Each structure stands twice: as C-alpha cells, then as structure tokens.
Amino acid sequence: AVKKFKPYTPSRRFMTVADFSEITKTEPEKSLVKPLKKTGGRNNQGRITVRFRGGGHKRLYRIIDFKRWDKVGIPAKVAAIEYDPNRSARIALLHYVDGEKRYIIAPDGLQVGQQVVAGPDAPIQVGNALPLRFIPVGTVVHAVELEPKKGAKLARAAGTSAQIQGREGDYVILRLPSGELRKVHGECYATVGAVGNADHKNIVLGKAGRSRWLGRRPHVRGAAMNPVDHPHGGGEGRAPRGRPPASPWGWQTKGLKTRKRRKPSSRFIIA
Amino acid sequence: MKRTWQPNRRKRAKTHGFRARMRTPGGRKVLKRRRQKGRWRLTPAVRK
RNA sequence: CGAUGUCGGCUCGUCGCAUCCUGGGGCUGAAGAAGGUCCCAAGGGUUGGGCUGUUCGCCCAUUAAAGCGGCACGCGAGCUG
RNA sequence: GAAUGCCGGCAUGAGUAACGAUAAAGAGGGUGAGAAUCCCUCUCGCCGUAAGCCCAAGGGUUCCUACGCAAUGGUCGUCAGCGUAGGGUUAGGCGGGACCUAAGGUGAAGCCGAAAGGCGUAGCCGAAGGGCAGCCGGUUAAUAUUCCGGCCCUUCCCGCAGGUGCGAUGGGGGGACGCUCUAGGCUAGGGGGACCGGAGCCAUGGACGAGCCCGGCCAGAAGCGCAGGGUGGGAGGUAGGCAAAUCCGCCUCCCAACAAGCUCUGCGUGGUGGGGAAGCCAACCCCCCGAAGCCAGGGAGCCAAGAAAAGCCUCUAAGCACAACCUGCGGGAACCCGUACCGCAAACCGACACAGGUGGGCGGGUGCAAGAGCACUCAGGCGCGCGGGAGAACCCUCGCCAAGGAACUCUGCAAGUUGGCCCCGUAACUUCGGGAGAAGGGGUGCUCCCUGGGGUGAUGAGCCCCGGGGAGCCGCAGUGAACAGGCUCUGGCGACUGUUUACCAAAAACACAGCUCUCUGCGAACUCGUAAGAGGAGGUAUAGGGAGCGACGCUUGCCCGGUGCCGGAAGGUCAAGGGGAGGGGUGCAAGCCCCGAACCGAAGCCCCGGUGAACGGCGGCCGUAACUAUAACGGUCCUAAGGUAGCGAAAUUCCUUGUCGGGUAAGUUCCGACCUGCACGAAAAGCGUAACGACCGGAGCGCUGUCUCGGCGAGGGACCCGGUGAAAUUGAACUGGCCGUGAAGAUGCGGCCUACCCGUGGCAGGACGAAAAGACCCCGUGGAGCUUUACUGCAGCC
RNA sequence: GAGCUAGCCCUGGCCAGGGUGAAGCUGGGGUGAGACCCAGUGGAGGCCCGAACCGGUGGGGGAUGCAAACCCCUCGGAUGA
RNA sequence: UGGUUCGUGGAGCCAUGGGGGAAUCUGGGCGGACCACCGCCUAAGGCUAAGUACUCCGGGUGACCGAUAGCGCACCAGUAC
RNA sequence: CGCGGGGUGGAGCAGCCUGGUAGCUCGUCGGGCUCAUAACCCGAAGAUCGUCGGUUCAAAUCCGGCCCCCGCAACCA
RNA sequence: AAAAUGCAGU
RNA sequence: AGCCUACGGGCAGGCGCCGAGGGUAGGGCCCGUGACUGGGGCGAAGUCGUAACAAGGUAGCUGUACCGGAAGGUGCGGCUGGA
Ligand SMILES: [Mg+2]
Ligand SMILES: [Mg+2]
Ligand SMILES: [Mg+2]
Numbered sequence A: 001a002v003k004k005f006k007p008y009t010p011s012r013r014f015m016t017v018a019d020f021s022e023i024t025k026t027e028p029e030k031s032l033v034k035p036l037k038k039t040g041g042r043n044n045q046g047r048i049t050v051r052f053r054g055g056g057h058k059r060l061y062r063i064i065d066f067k068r069w070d071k072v073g074i075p076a077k078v079a080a081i082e083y084d085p086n087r088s089a090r091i092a093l094l095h096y097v098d099g100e101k102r103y104i105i106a107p108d109g110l111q112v113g114q115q116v117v118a119g120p121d122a123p124i125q126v127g128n129a130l131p132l133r134f135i136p137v138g139t140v141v142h143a144v145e146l147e148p149k150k151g152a153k154l155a156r157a158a159g160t161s162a163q164i165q166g167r168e169g170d171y172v173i174l175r176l177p178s179g180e181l182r183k184v185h186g187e188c189y190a191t192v193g194a195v196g197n198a199d200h201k202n203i204v205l206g207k208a209g210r211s212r213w214l215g216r217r218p219h220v221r222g223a224a225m226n227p228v229d230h231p232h233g234g235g236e237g238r239a240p241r242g243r244p245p246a247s248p249w250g251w252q253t254k255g256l257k258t259r260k261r262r263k264p265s266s267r268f269i270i271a
Numbered sequence B: 001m002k003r004t005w006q007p008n009r010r011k012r013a014k015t016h017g018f019r020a021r022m023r024t025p026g027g028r029k030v031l032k033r034r035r036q037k038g039r040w041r042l043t044p045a046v047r048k
Numbered sequence C: 001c002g003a004u005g006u007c008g009g010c011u012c013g014u015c016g017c018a019u020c021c022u023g024g025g026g027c028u029g030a031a032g033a034a035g036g037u038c039c040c041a042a043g044g045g046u047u048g049g050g051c052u053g054u055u056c057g058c059c060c061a062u063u064a065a066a067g068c069g070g071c072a073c074g075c076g077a078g079c080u081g
Numbered sequence D: 001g002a003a004u005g006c007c008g009g010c011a012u013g014a015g016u017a018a019c020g021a022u023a024a025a026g027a028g029g030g031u032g033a034g035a036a037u038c039c040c041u042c043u044c045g046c047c048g049u050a051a052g053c054c055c056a057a058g059g060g061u062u063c064c065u066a067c068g069c070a071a072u073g074g075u076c077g078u079c080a081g082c083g084u085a086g087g088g089u090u091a092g093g094c095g096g097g098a099c100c101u102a103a104g105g106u107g108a109a110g111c112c113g114a115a116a117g118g119c120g121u122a123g124c125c126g127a128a129g130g131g132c133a134g135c136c137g138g139u140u141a142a143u144a145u146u147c148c149g150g151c152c153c154u155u156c157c158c159g160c161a162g163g164u165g166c167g168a169u170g171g172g173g174g175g176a177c178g179c180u181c182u183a184g185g186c187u188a189g190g191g192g193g194a195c196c197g198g199a200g201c202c203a204u205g206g207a208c209g210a211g212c213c214c215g216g217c218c219a220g221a222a223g224c225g226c227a228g229g230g231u232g233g234g235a236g237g238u239a240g241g242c243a244a245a246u247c248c249g250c251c252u253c254c255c256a257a258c259a260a261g262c263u264c265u266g267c268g269u270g271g272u273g274g275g276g277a278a279g280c281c282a283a284c285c286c287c288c289c290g291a292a293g294c295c296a297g298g299g300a301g302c303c304a305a306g307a308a309a310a311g312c313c314u315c316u317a318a319g320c321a322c323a324a325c326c327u328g329c330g331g332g333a334a335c336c337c338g339u340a341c342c343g344c345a346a347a348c349c350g351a352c353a354c355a356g357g358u359g360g361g362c363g364g365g366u367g368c369a370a371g372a373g374c375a376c377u378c379a380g381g382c383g384c385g386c387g388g389g390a391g392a393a394c395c396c397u398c399g400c401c402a403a404g405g406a407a408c409u410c411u412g413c414a415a416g417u418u419g420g421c422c423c424c425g426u427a428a429c430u431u432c433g434g435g436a437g438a439a440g441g442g443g444u445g446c447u448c449c450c451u452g453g454g455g456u457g458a459u460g461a462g463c464c465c466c467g468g469g470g471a472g473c474c475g476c477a478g479u480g481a482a483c484a485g486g487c488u489c490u491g492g493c494g495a496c497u498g499u500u501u502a503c504c505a506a507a508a509a510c511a512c513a514g515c516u517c518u519c520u521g522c523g524a525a526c527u528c529g530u531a532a533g534a535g536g537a538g539g540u541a542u543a544g545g546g547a548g549c550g551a552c553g554c555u556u557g558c559c560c561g562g563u564g565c566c567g568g569a570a571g572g573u574c575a576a577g578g579g580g581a582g583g584g585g586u587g588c589a590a591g592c593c594c595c596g597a598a599c600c601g602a603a604g605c606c607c608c609g610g611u612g613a614a615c616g617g618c619g620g621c622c623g624u625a626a627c628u629a630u631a632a633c634g635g636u637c638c639u640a641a642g643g644u645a646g647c648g649a650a651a652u653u654c655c656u657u658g659u660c661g662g663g664u665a666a667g668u669u670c671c672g673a674c675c676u677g678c679a680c681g682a683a684a685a686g687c688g689u690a691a692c693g694a695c696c697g698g699a700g701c702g703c704u705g706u707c708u709c710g711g712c713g714a715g716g717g718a719c720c721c722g723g724u725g726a727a728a729u730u731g732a733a734c735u736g737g738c739c740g741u742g743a744a745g746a747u748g749c750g751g752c753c754u755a756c757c758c759g760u761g762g763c764a765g766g767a768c769g770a771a772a773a774g775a776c777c778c779c780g781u782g783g784a785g786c787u788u789u790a791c792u793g794c795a796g797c798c
Numbered sequence E: 001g002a003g004c005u006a007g008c009c010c011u012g013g014c015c016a017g018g019g020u021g022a023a024g025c026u027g028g029g030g031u032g033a034g035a036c037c038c039a040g041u042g043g044a045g046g047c048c049c050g051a052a053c054c055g056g057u058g059g060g061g062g063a064u065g066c067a068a069a070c071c072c073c074u075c076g077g078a079u080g081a
Numbered sequence F: 001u002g003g004u005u006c007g008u009g010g011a012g013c014c015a016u017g018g019g020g021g022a023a024u025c026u027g028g029g030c031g032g033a034c035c036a037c038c039g040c041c042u043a044a045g046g047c048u049a050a051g052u053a054c055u056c057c058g059g060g061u062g063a064c065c066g067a068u069a070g071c072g073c074a075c076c077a078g079u080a081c
Numbered sequence G: 001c002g003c004g005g006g007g008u009g010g011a012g013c014a015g016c017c018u019g020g021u022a023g024c025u026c027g028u029c030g031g032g033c034u035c036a037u038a039a040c041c042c043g044a045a046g047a048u049c050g051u052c053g054g055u056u057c058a059a060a061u062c063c064g065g066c067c068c069c070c071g072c073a074a075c076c077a
Numbered sequence H: 001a002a003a004a005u006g007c008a009g010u
Numbered sequence I: 001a002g003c004c005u006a007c008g009g010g011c012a013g014g015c016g017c018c019g020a021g022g023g024u025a026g027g028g029c030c031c032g033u034g035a036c037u038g039g040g041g042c043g044a045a046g047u048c049g050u051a052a053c054a055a056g057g058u059a060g061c062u063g064u065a066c067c068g069g070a071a072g073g074u075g076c077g078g079c080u081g082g083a
C-alpha cells in the first residue's frame, strides 16, 4: 500500500516504506526446518565478481517449496503470510494436513486459513499448482517451472505472472512477465494466480543509506574513474564519453545484444 | 602515529609458520633454501 | 641547468638627475596676481583612502608637491605568497 | 690526488645548538670517598573519567632480596627498568585444552589441471560466540578465587538401597538471538543522621557545643520470605518429521485461561566465618538518592526482519533386559598448559627512558540545569633524570591600553565581540518540516515571610524532587571564577547527512536517493578461473548486469549524411573444403606424382532500412519601413540538419574596468540590467529551488592592537656560571672598500683608498652562501603510464 | 607480503548528558457517513546541541622536531552510509 | 607444428595434436619434392657395462691470497644486526 | 608577425584542377494578361573577370608583386 | 480543385 | 538633617509609580522615484501578408493544448450565432 513520511527530515520527505498489513499475523519466521545460515559474501574464491555488493543487514534464509508436486493431492491450510527479506514477494506459510508444513511464495489474494493444494486436478484457483497442461488457456499463474521436475524459476517477484496463451502439442505457450513468448513443457507445473505485493515497485528508498541496508555499496560511474580503470575514465575536465558507451571490460553497453547465438534454448521462444 | 608493525602471535605463527611453509611448494623451497644456507632459525622463531 | 628562487607587497634604505615641490635666475604674447618656457640647483621634502594579486592606472579627499629611474624589474639564509 | 668513489681513523662547525612538554619547588635529618639528583621527615605544586585502580594483546625475568657503579641513564648517582648472585609464578571450581560449532581453512567420495597444483561432499580444524563447577577473608620480601581458614560446589568410578523398557552418531524440542523506546521490583554505588562506637581537640577574639574529628560493613549452604523468567492440562485419530517411534507435527473432543499450580533465577534474610577508622612509641543502626548493571528468554513499537553446534530434555533402532539408565547415600578418582612483573606505558608498536599510537571494565565527593563537561578535591599517583643566576635585543605563549575603530590586508587572516539557563519576542521565503538559538530584549547573588503540588513514608515528621508570591541587603559586576554562538543582507556551486588525495588540494570533486537507455527467460546476461568450480543467486523481468543523469519543480527542441548498435531467408564479395573442364613430371607400360578452370561453399564486409537520455552536429552573403535608425519582409548560396525553450560580459566574454543602473567620498571585485553569446543551451542535461555547507564571492551592524603606531607587563628560551655535548658544511687560506679588468656580477688580477692584534652579543648585503648530478627547457634512434579509425599480434567472441 | 593500508566475511563491544516532538493510538469537535480540525498521549529521525569516540577547517608553533606528519588554539560527524 | 644447418623455401628425413586409414616379405620405410631405375635398412615392445659429466666429501699440489687479500666467516658467522 | 580561402553582369553563386566556349537563380528593360497591382506568360539588355607585370600563338583560367575581404594560429616558460 | 491586394479627405 | 511651630502635626528635602518625549531593535500599510522591462490607448495617405464578413474561397465561433514573422494553423470536445 506504500506508507509515506512527513518532511520532518530530508531524505524522509521522499522516502516511503512498504505497508505490512498483507504480512502481519506472523513476524518471526518458522523456526522449524525453515531458516538456514544464509551466507553473505559478494564474490567467489577470492576476487569480487559482482562489484558494489556487500554491507547490508543480517539476513536468515527461508527454504520455500519451489516444486509443490512433492505433496500431490495433500491439501493444506495457509497458516500465515510472513515477510521475507530474501525476496520481493511475500511468502505464505502453510500447514499441510499431512502434518508437515512448508513455505510458498505468497500469491496475490491468497488469504489466511483458506485451504489450498496442488495436483493434476486441484480447483483452478489461487494457490493451486497443476502441470501447466491442465490450466485453462488464459488464467494467470506464478511460480512456473521451465522444465518438468526442475522447480519454479519463472514469475516469482512481487507482481510478476505469466499467462497461458494457448496449447501447442506436447507444449504450451506462455507470455512470460518480460513479455517474451515462451513455450514451456506441458508437464511443467505452475501455481494459479499472480505474485502479490505488487506495490513493491513504488517504495522509494529515500536516502543513500537503505540502499546500503539492502547490501548495495555506492556504485561509481565509469566516467569518474581514469583511463587506467574504466574506458570512459580520464580526460582533463569532465567528458562526453568518447564513443560509444562501454562497460568497464570493453563491450558496448547501449544496444549490443548478448544472449548466446546458437543456444538450443531458442526454438521455444518468440518476442 | 599507529605504525606498521602490530605484533600478534597467532598471526606470525600462522603466516610464517614452519607448517605454513611446508604446505606450499613455494614455502617448501624457502626452507630448503635456508637450511642450505645454514640459518639458525628457518621459521621466524615465535613462542606461545 | 652537480639549481644565479621567478611578479607584486612589506621592511630597510642608498644612489642618479633628464627636478614634482621648496631656493636662485633669463626670456615671456611678463601690468598685478598667476601662468608658460628655459637655466642653475637634490639640501630636505614628496599624503591618506576606493578598485585590482597587480606594477600601472582610474577615481575620492587633501597638498608646497603629491618627480622619474638604478640598485639581480634593490631587498624570500629579512617576512608575505 | 681527485670517480658527490669504497672501507677505516681523526678533524672543522664548538665548548656552539641541545639536554625531550612552563605540573614547581624549599629545608632539616641520614647515608657515603663523593650527594641539587639516594633514603627519611616537614612545607609546597600537579593529576584525580586520571597523570588512580583491574583485564586483555604484546614484551619475556624487566618481579622480590643482597652486594655493586666501568658502561647504560641526554647531568649527577651512593640510585636504577643497569651488572652479579640467590630466591620467586602452587588451581577438579579462573583462563585455554581430553566440549560445540561461525567465517574461513582442511578434506575419505568425487571433479579439474603439462608438472607444480586448483576445486570439493562429509568429517575435521577454527573463538573474545555457545557450554561449564568458587565466594569472603588471612598469610609472603616476592604467588594467591591457585597456599591457608570458613562456608559451598562439579564431574567421573565403585558399592549399596530404592526407581524405570533401558538404549543411539539417529528423530524432535530446546539451545536461538535485530534496533530504538521502556515497566516493576532489586543490587552496585552515593548523600545525610539530632543515633551507635572511638582515641583525642577547645587554638587566635568567641564556642565544653544536638560541637570538631573518625568510622558505623563484607561473604554466607538448606529453609523462608519479596521481585520476576519460563509453562495450557485431556483423550482419541494420522496420509508428515526421507516413519524404525507411545516424541514432535497436524486435524477433532470435555474441562481450563488480564490466572493457579509446577519450575528456574535474582535479591533480601539466614547457622555461622571475617573485617573493622582517626589517634599519642571497637560499633556494625536509621532515613534519602539510585543505575547504562540484575530478575532476562520482561514488555511495547519499528523495518532493513535479526548465526551455527554441542551441553540439555524427550522419542523410539538394532541391541539388551543377569544388562542398562534414573534418584539417593556413601567410599574413592579428578590429568596437561597458563598464573612473576609492565600493561595509555621508561618494560607494548614508534632506531631513543621518544609530548605520537593502543581494545574492555571501575572511575568517589562538592558546585555549575544536566553530564563521562568544567573548577576544586577523596583514594591513590605524580613535580615530567640537568641544575644555578641574570631580567639586553630578538622569538614563543599570555595579559592590558589613551583617542580612532578595518584606515590593516589578497582576505577582518589573526584576535576580539557573542557566549549557559529562564521568560518576552522573532521577518523574507518555504518542499509547511523548516528558516529559528532568525534577529532584538529582560531575568540571573544572598536574606526573611507566605504558599502550591510530587516521590518515600503511613495519610502525619523527616528525607528528598519541581516550583509560586511579597518584602529586603551588598557590590563596578550575581551563569561574580571554569567549561560557554558574534549577528544580518545578498550572489555562485552542489539538493540534502555522507566520501577523498595516509603525508601540501575536503571542493563546486566521488557517492547519494531518483530519471532514462540498454542488456538478460535462467546451465540468464555479466564477472573470476586453463579448466573443475564459484559470484550473479539457493535470486528469476516489480529480478539481475552495464551506461549516462543525479532530490525536487518546469522542461529536455531540429539533424541517421558519416560512426556505433538493431533489424534485413535477396543481391555483391568471401577462406578452407567440395568440384574437377584442362594442362605438367616421369615410366615400355599399367600407373604413381603434380598443378588446375566453371560452379557450389560461412561469418564478416558492401548493401537496404531503423536508431539521439547511442558517438556526435545543430551556417553565410546581399536588400527592404514616408526623418533617420533599424529590419517584422525579400533574394541567393550551402547543409545530414542549420541552435527551439530557457539563460547569457556567466566557474563560459577575447576586445573588457563593455555600457547603463545600485552600493561607496571613491568600487578592474560585487548586485540588477542590456545582449554583436571571440567561444551558453537542454540528462558530458537546461532554467530554477525551500533547506543544508569548516565550499567561493560582495556588502552592513556589533567588536577589536589588523592598522594609524606603538607602549608596558608575565612567563619559556635567548644572555652568565657548573655539568654532558651534536650537525650539515669544509681544496687550502695569512678571506677589506672603490673604479677598472677578467669566460661578461672579484677578499685572491690592476690602480687608488682604508686597515693595530683577538674575541663577545647581535643583523643578514655578499661569499653567484647550504641543501638536492634542475622539476621547466632541449638533447638520448633512453624509460615508463595513457590513447586511438598508427603497426602487428593475443585473450575473447562470430 | 592485506601484523600498515583498501574492501568484504564471521563474532563481539562502544556511543555522557541535554533538545526538537513525526506516525500512531485516545478524547473532543465534524459530517449523512467522511476527509479534516483540535487538545492530550506518544517517542520517530543518514533530526538539533555537545563529551567519550571517529575526524582534520583555519591560524600559529614546529622544520639537524617531542614526532620521517608532532603540539596549541580553533573547527566537522557524534543512532549511523 | 616441433627438431636439424634448414626462417615455407624445390623441403625430404625425425617426432606428432586433428581427419582418413593398410599390408606381414609379390610386406614396408629410406637414399632431400616427384617418377623410374639401382642400392641401404627392417618401424609401430624392452634391457645393456665401459669410455663421458659433477666436486658436498678425503688427499696432493701451486712463477694462488696473506686479515680492505683470500670464501661472506683465519676469531663461537650465515652469527651480531 | 605568421598559415588559409576568396574577389566575375545589380545581388547571391558557378566556370579557375585539366587555357581558347563566361553558366544559374534573381533582379533590370520592352511587350502582353487584368479596371489596376502583384503574381504569372513572351522577348532582350548588361560582366577593366580586383589591380601590375610574366608565360603562351591565345589566359578570368598557369605564374609570381601588390590592394583589399572573411577564416585559423600565436604554444613551454 | 488551387487564385493575393485596391492610399487620405469626400 | 534643616525652617517656622499652632507639635502624633505642616514645609523643605528624599525614594517610588506613571509619565511627554528621546534612543535601539523588528514588523505592517500607503505614496513618490528607479537602469531595464511588459503590454496598452492614440496619432491624413509607412512595411508583410489577408484571419473574419458572401461555402470569404479550409463554415464560424468557442474552452483547452501544441506550434508559427504576423494575422493564424492543427488536435480533442462543444455551440449554430453554418449548411
Ligand atoms: Mg573456500
Ligand atoms: Mg585460498
Ligand atoms: Mg554513481
């Protein structure tokens, strides 16, 4: 819903945090086999590989069910909707009748105590997962897999969601969130409905800090470095680049396509 | 002001240790070199 | 060039005369008072601000007058920067 | 005999600078060969969130004792952190280890790499984190939670009694977590007492006083209280906890729930053990304040959403039930290492007994609003390891000044003013928060009287915490000393807090929220790596990488000719390779060998078209209005298209101090304007903007030694005496002026002049003074960093 | 060679005292119901003042130093990037 | 592609990372593109003294040094620092 | 002070590389069309080619000397 | 499709 | 602490409140004037086009928005005061 603050301090006037009514009900994550030592570290065996990472508030991980076909047919009641620092969407905790409990990227609308389930049959509606093939051409859907038995990978951030665009044999066409028109295998699962927390994209960090609380260290412009560092660098007196916007490593950055050429992954795309 | 040498035993032992040396081919060849020169200490003698 | 620190300021001066005053003096289109010009003469004088890093100027207010030059564009083992 | 040569010795500067914080000294006793400097005492000063106590790291015998003084000690030394010798460090409970896991490291399995070796699961290693049993005293010259005394515990092993399905590396719970704000009880700690206990004291005019002065606790099993922290009990089903389960987890079912009970802490109290001031060679009580600590896993609120593992409960597996656990109570058993001493420092990091640097705890009392601030002061520790005189210049630090009051100057640089608390009272502008401590005022001490609530009590006295009113007293002055904003107007740049050139730049630079472009569908793109593997991410387009812009407001024009990027199943060209017309060498031959044309052959390039918050660009010359002047209008050439809004002598304007206006007595700066913009202009953003700024500019007021213009004064040096005693430099020197001369700026040649010999305190004109084989400059077929449509390669990628 | 320094990771600690008074709650007002307005409570913030602590503005001193970056006065941050 | 004297050169031989891919004496390699003659030699498994190299070590020597020489060390030196 | 480009009918531009030819728009003048004016239609007229000398048979053209114009430079100190 | 203008006073 | 005294009292003298006004500081309203600047009204025969009035030769007008030497043009909607 996005909350706004009074100007009782600059960098506040503008700032705006996320409204947490959707969550509520449960603050501390589910102790139970659910949190893990989420290991911070902005780079591999030594050197940094993703500049400007680091800093940022301590964060615990919540293991969520990214393949609900685990417990097929076993229905569960959605116990609570908790906050997740690890992602943009909210996760919802659900107690299965199987006794067992586990998390699941909280879909838009999913409400407390309501029941939900997954199976090649579940009542087409909010929170139910079923192999893409059994889902009504059209009906939106999130946490979609990309290959049978390899877990959800598509549509997982607040508001994301793909649409069933039509069937085409062994496969089914989806118009991913990006807009690319993908062909996902029929068996791939996917849970009905969208992602929720759609307001996410509106929070304005506000100050330079916050940007830090998220673990994002200042990011300097090539322009401000020297020939030695970046290519844009150098020049005695502020510069207009010098043909044609590039990245610290060489490669042009305005327009140059990069996705692999002969990737067998084509054949199932369009857009 | 706060000079460069800030003595620490666990450091010294762990960085220039006899074991640390033996563990790297470069480190092994250091000893080989010293022993061969006759140094009285090979590994910066420390103590705990 | 195995270094002769480079503007201006400040401080300290000292020298030249082609003299801005003040002393003599000839012309004058010098009646007077003033001025002009030239001659002799530095002995001693030769202001305080506005602007500028400025030297220099331009203004302001006075003055008998507010002279021009040399001293490594005097003077950074004296200061400032 | 020269290499700013190498090694060594000894010179000169020179008895010169200095002797390391301006916290500070004096004297009388000792000691001794010798004492300003060692010991004792008495004055005196300094620190006292330390300049005092404890702990860590680091150092490693520096500890204590007895002898010593060559050297070490910036002097002296009888002293010592020095030399020599001899002692000294005691733990089941403190800290490490026969416990745990974090990052990270290592690494059976496994993956990878010419070799070296790189990854990597488990496991292992890994600690200021988790876990775990000691408190108060007394002793030594030197160790003590270590030895001793009292009280109190922890494991293990065994025997015994009495209990129970006992039992895992396995399952579950728990261990378990953030930040800001906080409740109620306590304790530490402190302030008082008309009370208890004490040696003593009445001085110097007065007080034998409810006088002065000293001190009135600590540790403590079980039980008991008072604060809390934890915790629903049942009973049925079970598709889950990689079911082995009566444990978790789920549903269902009585009862019960701002609770009781059951537990676990903390704090009192507790048998009893201990200590126990000031003073001249033995009490142990009652008021009050009160934690940032305890009860602690307390409670609330918030968004950025807050380790793990073992100990510990509990569950069942084989097993085994003659075991075994569990509770008792006795007996026994309880290893290794560390423990001296320094520890904001003379024992650590800085070559030094070095004004530097060093993490954690305690850190008393009075006053000032508060406080860890400031002044003084307990406890405790210090006077800084050269001294003694003198009272020049000159420098440092500090105090004051007649009249003036920024005239100083690049600049009010520096210094001054202001300076706390309370009450009045405060403008433009504004993003309505702010600007605001805006400005500008008044109050401020002590005395007596009246009087309001609070906390603790008990409602009532005390004791504290806020106050309100009225009279009154003394000073030049009451935040009487210390800590302690000078204010306003107006531009520029940047929104803002922030970041930077360790060691000359703190900015208008970098960052920053936020805007846009672009890449990327996940074994993502991107990065690192030969690879394996890893980051990206246990993320998934509201996400991630690159780029520019840089809050916000109003906006961001025109040009795809060239360049980049994007799209183009046609064309043109194109390398292997396919294809072989056709030719060649040899053999007597079959053959064997060679060349080799058509055509077919990718990417790329050409080519077509898109593309500007992609590189980038965004004109000239003539003429014309009925006064002139000017030119809304026209002609013409050129372009890919000729600069829109807005701004403009500006961080941009050369001519320039443009020209008007303002401020000033006077204004190359400054502010407002104009615009022929040498050479603004729209995300290398354009124009603005409240607030913010140790940023840069201009003006006012306040005040001032900045200045007219200096004067005096204080102290630490400088100066004299004792003591210790360097340095760069140095061809050798018996080293004057002028006018000449000279490789062109002479103590050293020439001529003239002046000049007895040697120092001391001072000034810096000269010795082309010192110091760096000049940074600039050029030279060298010297070198490095950087660049690109220079050459040529390689990674990469197609 | 990261015992200095730069960043990051794991785990700990530190930040006197004073001020401003946001969101919320609550009551009153308000309306058809609201928005909203009032007091009170509340205790937010790369908020304000200022020690520790982290800096290094400006000036002076120092320049064979106390010191191969020091000292004095002064000044910036001081619940946060 | 490397090796040789051999730097693509008329470039054989000797190795061999890629592709294709035989025969066993009427078999198969060489004699510097290639043919033909003529001649050498037996690939795709292995072992093999000695003559050669070196001087930590012991010995003998020197138109070698004689403590700034000679080894860095005549000495308690890879020490002090 | 230097290196450039340029000058042609009234105006604004071509021909100048590689000599003999002077081209274009506009304007000008003469005619029409309109009541008239523009605009349109038809027909012309005008060029020391900046000057001086050189070269050639012949120069605006090639060559130098001047004269005017509008550009770019003027760096290390 | 398209296709401008008409001086002052009167 | 004076004078006259008719003496607890009166005057002088002293202190205090307020107080004209002066001073300092900060606001508000009005008037004048100001380089430069914005349009406005007016002035016998100026320059450019021709928007409107006759389907004014693109029906006109209108609120708005963008663009343009200028009248004006174009988009969206609206009116008829046009067909
Ligand atoms: Mg690793
Ligand atoms: Mg490593
Ligand atoms: Mg940046």
Ligand SMILES: [Mg+2]
Pocket (backbone or CB within 6 Å): A224, A225, A226
């Ligand atoms: Mg830079």
Ligand SMILES: [Mg+2]
Pocket (backbone or CB within 6 Å): none
């Ligand atoms: Mg680098």
Ligand SMILES: [Mg+2]
Pocket (backbone or CB within 6 Å): A227, A228, A230, A231
């Ligand atoms: Mg580069």
Ligand SMILES: [Mg+2]
Pocket (backbone or CB within 6 Å): A231, A232, A233, A234, A235, A239, A240, A241, A242
């Ligand atoms: Mg550049």
Ligand SMILES: [Mg+2]
Pocket (backbone or CB within 6 Å): B008, B011
């Ligand atoms: Mg370390």
Ligand SMILES: [Mg+2]
Pocket (backbone or CB within 6 Å): none
């Ligand atoms: Mg010299």
Ligand SMILES: [Mg+2]
Pocket (backbone or CB within 6 Å): none
């Ligand atoms: Mg005269």
Ligand SMILES: [Mg+2]
Pocket (backbone or CB within 6 Å): none
């Ligand atoms: Mg006369």
Ligand SMILES: [Mg+2]
Pocket (backbone or CB within 6 Å): none
């Ligand atoms: Mg003179």
Ligand SMILES: [Mg+2]
Pocket (backbone or CB within 6 Å): none
């Ligand atoms: Mg002179």
Ligand SMILES: [Mg+2]
Pocket (backbone or CB within 6 Å): C073
């Ligand atoms: Mg000169």
Ligand SMILES: [Mg+2]
Pocket (backbone or CB within 6 Å): none
């Ligand atoms: Mg000079």
Ligand SMILES: [Mg+2]
Pocket (backbone or CB within 6 Å): none
């Ligand atoms: Mg300067």
Ligand SMILES: [Mg+2]
Pocket (backbone or CB within 6 Å): D001, D002
């Ligand atoms: Mg010689």
Ligand SMILES: [Mg+2]
Pocket (backbone or CB within 6 Å): none
């Ligand atoms: Mg020597």
Ligand SMILES: [Mg+2]
Pocket (backbone or CB within 6 Å): D016
């Ligand atoms: Mg001397």
